[PDB]
């Protein structure tokens, strides 16, 4: 059950995270990962829905894995842009706010991060560009077009 979470600590340590509230209960806890291609509106839309879900459900730990189909730009670039605005993620009220968060910010590519992402996909039998979620170890998707 756990294996997806054990084999990918390096990746999962670097992605944007909204932790479960401290004041939330153990029974309200859930672990939701959204894996989506943030180069495209459909992937962005899925993350936006997940942000809205977390805003209203504060026992949820949400983390976000940018999973582009095209890797000409390092997958770590949008990841770092979003990571740099982690404290703002629950202040978003508008889809445009997420778009804006992804649009600018100069970051060196993280070569090790990119390799950890490729490894995560391979070992999870998913493809670059696929949009999916992991809920308490259950992988659901891909969610097609
Ligand atoms: C096409 C797909 C579109 C996707 C939309 C955007 C993606 C985000 C949406 C994903 C949401 C999926 O999950 C929804 C369910 O979660 C709702 C929030 O609730 C989380 C809580 O879940 C807890 C699960 O329950 C397990 C706890 C069991 C506890 C048992 O307690 C008994 C103890 O009692 C005796 C003790 O004295």
Commentary on this structure:
The protein is an alpha+beta fold. The protein has helices at 3-6, 9-14, 41-56, 75-84, 95-103, 111-123, and strands at residues 17-18, 30-36, 60-66, 132-135, 138-140. The protein has one domain. The chain is built from six helices and five strands. A five-stranded mixed sheet has the order 1-3-2-4-5. It is globular. 3,6,12,15,18,21,24-heptaoxahexatriacontan-1-ol is lined by residues 27-28, 30, 32, 46, 49-50, 53, 57, 59, 133, 135, 143.
Features of the shown structure:
145 residues, alpha+beta, 6 helices, 5 strands, UDP-glucose-glycoprotein glucosyltransferase-like protein
Short précis:
The protein is α+β, with helices and mostly antiparallel strands and 145 residues long. It has one domain.
Map the helices and strands:
Elements: H1 3-6, H2 9-14, E1 17-18, E2 30-36, H3 41-56, E3 60-66, H4 75-84, H5 95-103, H6 111-123, E4 132-135, E5 138-140
Parallel strand pairs: 2-3
Antiparallel strand pairs: 1-3, 2-4, 4-5
This protein binds 3,6,12,15,18,21,24-heptaoxahexatriacontan-1-ol (PQE).
Residues 27-28, 30, 32, 46, 49-50, 53, 57, 59, 133, 135, 143 line the site of 3,6,12,15,18,21,24-heptaoxahexatriacontan-1-ol.
Organism: Chaetomium thermophilum (strain DSM 1495 / CBS 144.50 / IMI 039719) (Thermochaetoides thermophila)
Protein name: UDP-glucose-glycoprotein glucosyltransferase-like protein
Domain UDP-glucose:glycoprotein glucosyltransferase thioredoxin-like: 1-145
């Amino acid at each position: 059950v756990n294996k997806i979470y054990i084999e990918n600590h390096d990746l999962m340590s670097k992605v944007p995270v909204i932790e479960a509230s401290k004041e939330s209960t153990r029974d309200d806890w859930a672990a939701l990962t959204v894996v989506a291609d943030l180069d495209d509106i459909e992937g962005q839309e899925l993350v936006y829905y997940a942000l809205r879900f977390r805003k209203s459900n504060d026992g949820v730990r949400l983390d976000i894995v940018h999973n582009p189909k095209d890797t000409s730009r390092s997958p770590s670039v949008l990841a770092q842009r979003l990571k740099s605005r982690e404290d703002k993620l629950l202040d978003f009220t508008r889809f445009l706010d997420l778009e804006t968060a992804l649009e600018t910010g100069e970051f060196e590519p993280d070569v090790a991060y990119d390799a950890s992402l490729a490894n995560f996909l391979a070992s999870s039998n998913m493809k670059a560009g696929d949009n999916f979620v992991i809920l308490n170890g259950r992988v659901l998707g891909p969610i097609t077009s």
